[PDB]
Design a protein around this ligand. Structure first.
Ligand SMILES: *[C@H]1O[C@H](CO)[C@@H](O[C@@H]2O[C@H](CO)[C@@H](O[C@@H]3O[C@H](CO)[C@@H](O)[C@H](O[C@H]4O[C@H](CO)[C@@H](O)[C@H](O)[C@@H]4O)[C@@H]3O)[C@H](O)[C@H]2NC(C)=O)[C@H](O)[C@H]1NC(C)=O
Ligand SMILES: CCCCCCCCCCCS[C@@H]1O[C@H](CO)[C@@H](O[C@H]2O[C@H](CO)[C@@H](O)[C@H](O)[C@H]2O)[C@H](O)[C@H]1O
Ligand SMILES: CCCCCCCCCCCS[C@@H]1O[C@H](CO)[C@@H](O[C@H]2O[C@H](CO)[C@@H](O)[C@H](O)[C@H]2O)[C@H](O)[C@H]1O
Length: 1250
């Protein structure tokens, strides 16, 4: 994707049109932004495609001769359409020469010309102009017909071809061998093949017609250029490499700053991710401001890189626009230096200059079109290989023999077999078994042997590698496959039912099924009972859209489906293996009735149900070991005996004892992220209001974009004035000619500087707003109550990506893309005004036609009416049927319904197809109007222009007529691409609405607050009739009047069942949540009165699983505290009391080793003691212990528990323990049961009562 758009961007770089230079620069920045960039800042490539490509002639096979002719007709007509603009260049030269001449006549009182002395009468001018006017009229009607034929022909053939390609592919894929589906064992194969089926259509449609059109515009565009002046063309083409180098300069800058900016914010992205993920930890350790500082330092670094991006984009885009007009200047300077010599005609100079532009523009338009053909040849291969190109060895559609009437005598003889995939491990090795007509034979054995493969070889899914399998004496390889499948019924372990009604699934059992026939088989399979009990009965849909039936219910319908055709040979492959014990009963009762009256081969997991089989065949390592009924094999003490007794023992022992999901683009997500919240989407003004602090940069940027806007209307004056030089001059073509040619150098310098100042300063305003919103939003998030983080929308990753992509998404509506729209709007107003200033009669006529011209440009964009979402939605329905057939090929191939699924796909394709060819005509008509409306303007402007000169007074002068035309046509050159801002703006309005609303949400329990009582704690913790419920589950109350008191230095212990309320004591005291009744007093003061930040620093926590941050152990211990507060000696002193000094000091680098790097290298016992080290450095007045030991009351438990008691010495403590053993040594203990304490006392005292 990225390698293509990079080469396409160079093709656009060679375009000499001034509006294209703006267009090609805007598109280059898009190439290195969201969705086009990976995680490192690099461009996406190769991943989104096939290695081998199909021939273009081969690609267009399946087209009738009539359509192949339509393809030929449409191609020739396309070359004519492309030859239109170069043909206009000759007409533009002739009419300008005619107009410039009549001016000399008016300047010289109505006479004859200087060259050759031609009396240029009113009729000489009238004949010249009407000749041009009639030509533009001929092209207006002509190019509409030329345009409509090109598109209608190409889209009609593209639809007619792909409609045949779709059905011929499904026709072929269901007839493939099962072995092929083993090699292509991917479940996404069907969906990927249909994704390719669409990509072939995209690159064989009208896009090829367009490719030929832009191809001939490059050729005829330069032919006309070279045949009029081979010198000026070389002069002009010599300046393009300097312009292309500036184009490369944009691509080089935007790519290197995309990598540098993503790497610099990657550091900030890790800060926001690791702290929100464990916010309860960072809040407890009191280091929110430390993190707020790190993220601010990192975002400032990303801003510095972002402002520098605008500087390099400013010089690049500024230079490219400047070198563009230098190409004009240099051509005009040598142009007068050729007309004065008499070597070059003026009209031919106007033609050659216009022709080169049409040619250079064509190159950048051809590239994108040829590329779609390239991906069309690729995607086709995967389809083609399957598509009749490979003759499958197991053809589901052939002729073997049908004459025989089957009794049911099966004979497996010396059958050796190995699956094609994994051909190294054999499965069957000389198996010999016999099944007589009517017998209900059973295959028993271990997992190794292939009892189940016998069924696969009887259905002929795979061929016998050595040996033979015969039905009624005839080898299966000789019998007709379709006939074989119709006579042999299968009931596999996992039943496959298609997305249709119950009776429709059963009907797939027989060709001419009757309702009476179905119920008879449905009652036999014990399914009639539950079907009547559910709504719609048989007419109910069973599948994805319908009701989800039970596994045992689904199997009984499958049993019924196998019975409807009334088979002579029926196979049961562990049909009761994937069912629960309660549901297995009815199914087996149904399998028994189904087996009676025919020959049946049963593969069973439960050997109890295999007891009364007519014959039991035991398999081992792919061969038969014993054959005989239950009585015989049990008397032999063979493999069967071993299996039965072993199983029946396990059965007796058990009976006595017991009896990534979603992925899409930015626009869609931001619509759902606006949802979930109150998020009222923002507008442009609101976003500017937030960018108020950067109003200076924003003002300079928009002011320099307004002055920059006046450059197109003046370029209009600078060009018509250069023409006016040739309008009657006593060899003054040099004095005035070299002046205007050099005036384009001034113009180039004017736009170069204006363009630089625009992108750079709007770059500061946008990147600064990004920084401002980032620091503002993260401070808002860290100051939240923690009940905030319990909400789904406030997930660690959802907030992280909002600061990563959504804030820079808001940026795109304020950077240089927004600035250029202002530039385009100003030129459009100034130009139209300047046009009226020169002549209102001419101006008003042109403007009256412009809405028709714009409408034609609108239709060239391809969008008709509003959207295409409903048109291509009907194609998905046909896909769903075909995908389901490929997902369940084994089932459709066994029921021989592979032919019926093909017809159901075709019938569902008929609706979308009939509408599509109807659409090809409408779409063609649309392009006819699109590619002919430009000639409609010229045929009217020159007709109205002539009528204003041919008048008696006269009303308007020849040159003044042209100054009006070029004032509008040049000033509205940039308007077509100006509409590319609105999709980016709409995307930014969603992002802003979320972010600005997120900032409006203030905390209920404001951390980072400087307000409240900042007191020195002692330890008097008191809970008084405390009632609490979690914010996400407000109704269900966890604490129901918890009351207790803890004195300084005293330790209380909370013990009880799970979900009683003892777990919330550590949270409420650290103020993670507020009480819903009752107060919590800490040293006399109620907890709500205290300043959170100041009291949390005097409280420490050691949890069950303590999380450590990505840093050194030294820094991980003193995480909260500032560097210039605690000495290194205090850290080691804290480590020696926590029993870690030996682990770290006697370890390389000491405490400077990276802990928590890609998981923790240290054990759960080491982490728990580093958590004790954290608590000791900053001597806590109270210390919260919540499930302190996660060492499973074993060896690692005694080492860490002894260290815990060395800490809770001079400080008060509260221990919450799930294990009642480690509770002893506490000054008091309490038992919580329903959110209230029942009994209190000491270990000794509490033990007395029972
Ligand atoms: C190219 O442009 C026009 C074509 O319409 C043409 O203009 C002529 O201008 C003259 C001078 O102003 C006009 O006036 C007179 O026309 C009559 C009838 O044609 C002539 O008889 C006149 O000629 C002379 O007659 C006498 C002969 O000696 C003189 O005494 C007297 O002074 C005149 O000079 C005179 O031209 C005239 O109406 C038009 N021409 C015509 C044919 O009507 C101009 O001449 C053309 N240029 C060239 C080089 O062909
Ligand atoms: C409802 C009647 C509307 C009439 C008002 C017209 C207002 C001025 C023209 C606005 C529409 S023209 C615009 O012109 C662009 C260029 O022709 C179209 O973009 C297409 O062509 C571009 C080439 O410049 C490609 O870059 C772009 O990928 C493609 O979508 C857009 O789809 C198309 O919307
Ligand atoms: C009251 C006020 C009414 C205002 C109405 C404004 C209507 C403006 C219509 C703009 C149509 S888009 C315009 O279409 C023009 C062709 O119709 C484009 O002109 C360029 O491309 C042409 C080839 O299609 C060249 O002939 C032309 O030289 C070039 O400038 C421009 O690049 C492209 O921006």
């Amino acid at each position: 994707n990225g390698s293509l758009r990079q080469s396409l961007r160079t093709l656009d770089s060679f375009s000499l049109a001034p509006e294209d230079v703006l267009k090609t620069a805007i598109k280059t920045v898009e190439d290195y932004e969201g969705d086009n960039i990976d995680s490192n800042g690099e461009i996406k490539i190769t991943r989104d495609e096939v290695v081998n490509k199909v021939s273009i002639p081969q690609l267009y096979r399946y087209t009738t001769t009539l359509e192949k002719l339509l393809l030929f007709i449409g191609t020739l007509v396309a070359v004519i359409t492309g030859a239109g603009l170069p043909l206009m260049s000759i007409l533009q030269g002739k009419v300008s020469q005619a107009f410039i001449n009549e001016q000399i006549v008016i300047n010289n009182n109505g006479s004859t010309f200087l060259p050759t002395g031609q009396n240029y009468t009113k009729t000489d001018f009238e004949h010249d102009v009407m000749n041009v006017v009639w030509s533009y009229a001929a092209m207006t009607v002509g190019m509409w017909a030329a345009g409509q034929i090109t598109v209608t022909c190409y889209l009609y053939v593209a639809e007619q071809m792909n409609n045949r390609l779709r059905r011929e592919f499904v026709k072929s894929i269901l007839r493939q061998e099962i072995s092929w589906f083993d090699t292509n064992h991917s479940g996404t194969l069907a969906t990927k093949l249909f994704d390719n089926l669409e990509r072939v259509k995209e690159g064989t449609g009208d896009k090829i017609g367009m490719a030929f059109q832009y191809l001939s515009q490059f050729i005829t565009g330069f032919i006309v250029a070279f045949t009029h002046s081979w010198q000026l063309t070389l002069v002009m083409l010599a300046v393009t490499p300097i312009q292309a180098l500036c184009g490369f300069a944009i691509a080089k800058s935007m790519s290197t700053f995309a990598i540098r900016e993503t790497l610099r914010y990657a550091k900030a992205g890790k800060v926001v991710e690791e702290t929100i993920s464990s916010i309860r930890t960072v809040v407890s350790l009191n280091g929110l401001r430390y993190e707020l500082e790190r993220y601010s330092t990192a975002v400032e670094e990303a801003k510095k890189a972002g402002v520098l991006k605008g500087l390099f984009l400013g010089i690049s885009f500024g230079a490219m626009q400047a070198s563009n007009f230098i190409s004009f200047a240099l051509a005009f300077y040598i142009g007068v230096g050729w007309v004065h010599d008499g070597s070059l005609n003026f009209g031919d100079m106007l033609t050659t200059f216009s022709s080169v532009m049409m040619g250079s523009m064509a190159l950048g338009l051809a590239g994108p079109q040829l590329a779609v053909l390239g991906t069309a040849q690729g995607a086709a291969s995967g389809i083609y290989e399957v598509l009749d190109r490979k003759p499958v060895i197991d053809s589901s559609s052939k002729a073997g023999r049908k004459d025989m009437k089957i009794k049911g005598d099966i004979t497996v003889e010396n059958v050796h077999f190995t699956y094609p995939s994994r051909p190294d491990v054999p499965i069957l090795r000389g198996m010999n078994l016999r099944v007589n007509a009517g017998q209900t034979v059973a295959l028993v054995g271990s997992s190794g042997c292939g009892k189940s493969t016998i069924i696969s070889l009887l259905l002929r899914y795979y061929d016998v590698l050595k040996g033979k399998i015969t039905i009624d004496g005839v080898d299966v390889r000789d019998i007709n496959l379709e006939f074989l499948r119709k006579n042999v019924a299968v009931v596999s372990q996992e039943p496959a039912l298609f997305n249709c009604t119950i009776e429709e699934n059963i009907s797939l059992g027989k060709e001419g099924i009757t309702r009476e026939e179905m119920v008879a088989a449905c009652k036999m399979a014990n399914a009639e009972k539950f079907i009547k009990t559910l709504p719609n009965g048989y007419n109910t849909l069973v599948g994805d859209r319908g009701t989800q039936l039970s596994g045992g219910q689904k199997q009984r319908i499958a049993i019924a489906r196998a019975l409807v055709r009334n088979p002579k040979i029926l196979l049961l492959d562990e049909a009761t293996s994937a069912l629960d014990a309660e549901s297995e009963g009815i199914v087996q009762q149904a399998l028994d009735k189904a087996a009676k009256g025919r020959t049946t081969i049963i593969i069973a997991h439960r050997l109890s149900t295999i007891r009364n089989a007519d014959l039991i065949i035991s398999c081992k390592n792919g061969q038969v070991v014993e054959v005989g009924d239950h009585r015989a094999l049990m008397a032999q003490q063979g493999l069967y005996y071993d299996l039965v007794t072993a199983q029946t023992f396990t059965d007796a022992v058990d009976s006595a004892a017991e009896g990534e999901r979603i992925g899409k683009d930015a626009l869609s997500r931001l619509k759902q992220e606006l949802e979930e919240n109150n998020a009222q989407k923002t507008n442009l003004f609101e976003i500017l209001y937030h960018a108020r602090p950067h109003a200076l940069s924003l003002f300079i940027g928009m002011s320099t974009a307004t002055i920059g806007g006046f450059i197109y209307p003046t370029y209009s004056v600078f060009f018509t004035s250069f023409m006016n030089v040739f309008a009657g001059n006593p060899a003054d073509f040099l004095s005035q000619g070299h002046f205007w040619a050099l005036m384009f150098l001034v113009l180039a310098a004017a736009q170069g500087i204006c363009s630089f100042l625009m992108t750079f300063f709007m770059g500061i305003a946008s990147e600064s707003l990004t920084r401002d919103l980032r620091n503002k939003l993260f401070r808002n998030v860290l100051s939240q109550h923690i009940g905030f983080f319990d909400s789904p929308q406030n997930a660690s990753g959802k907030i992280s990506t909002r600061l990563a992509t959504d804030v820079p998404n808001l940026r795109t509506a304020i950077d240089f893309r927004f600035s250029t729209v202002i530039t385009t709007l100003v030129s459009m107003v100034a130009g139209i005004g300047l046009a009226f200033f020169y002549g209102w009669q001419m101006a008003l006529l042109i403007i009256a036609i412009l809405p028709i011209v714009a409408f034609g440009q609108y239709l060239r964009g391809r969008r008709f009416t509003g959207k295409n979402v409903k048109s291509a939605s009907e194609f998905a329905d046909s896909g769903k049927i075909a995908i389901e057939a490929i997902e369940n090929v084994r089932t459709v191939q066994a029921l021989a319904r592979e032919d019926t699924f093909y017809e159901n796909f075709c019938e569902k394709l008929d609706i979308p197809h009939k509408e599509a060819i109807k659409e090809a005509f409408i779409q063609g008509l649309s392009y006819g109007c699109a590619s002919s409306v430009l000639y409609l303007l010229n045929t009217c402007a020159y007709r109205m222009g002539l009528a204003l000169i041919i008048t008696d007074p006269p009303t308007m002068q020849p040159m003044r007529v042209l100054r009006v035309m070029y004032a509008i046509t040049i000033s509205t050159s940039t308007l077509g691409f100006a509409t590319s801002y609105f999709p980016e703006y709409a995307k930014a309005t969603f992002a802003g609405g979320i972010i600005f609303g997120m900032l409006r949400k203030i905390s209920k329990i404001d951390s980072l607050s400087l307000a409240g009582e900042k007191k020195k704690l002692y330890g008097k913790v008191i809970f008084k009739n405390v009632r609490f419920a979690y914010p996400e589950r407000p109704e269900i109350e966890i604490l129901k009047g918890l009351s207790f008191s803890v004195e300084p230095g005293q330790t209380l212990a909370l013990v009880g069942p799970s979900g009683c309320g003892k777990s919330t004591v550590v949270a409420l005291l650290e103020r993670f949540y507020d009480t819903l009744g009752g107060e919590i007093f800490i040293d006399g003061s109620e907890i709500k009165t205290l300043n959170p930040e100041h009291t949390r620093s005097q409280i420490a926590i050691v949890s069950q699983e303590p999380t450590l941050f990505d840093c050194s152990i030294a820094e991980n211990i003193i995480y909260g505290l500032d560097p210039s507060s605690v000495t290194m000696a205090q850290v080691e002193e804290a480590a020696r009391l926590a029993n870690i000094h030996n682990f770290i000091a006697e370890l390389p680098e000491g405490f400077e080793t990276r802990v928590g790097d890609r998981g923790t290298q240290l054990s759960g016992g080491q982490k728990q003691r580093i958590a004790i080290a954290r608590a000791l450095v900053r001597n806590p007045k109270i210390l919260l212990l919540d499930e302190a030991t996660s060492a499973l009351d074993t060896e690692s438990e005694k080492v860490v528990q002894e260290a815990l008691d060395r800490a809770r010495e001079g400080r008060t403590c509260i221990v919450i323990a799930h294990r009642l053993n480690t509770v002893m040594n506490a000054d008091c203990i309490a038992v919580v049961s329903n959110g209230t304490i029942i009994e209190k006392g000491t270990h000794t005292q509490l033990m007395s009562e029972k």
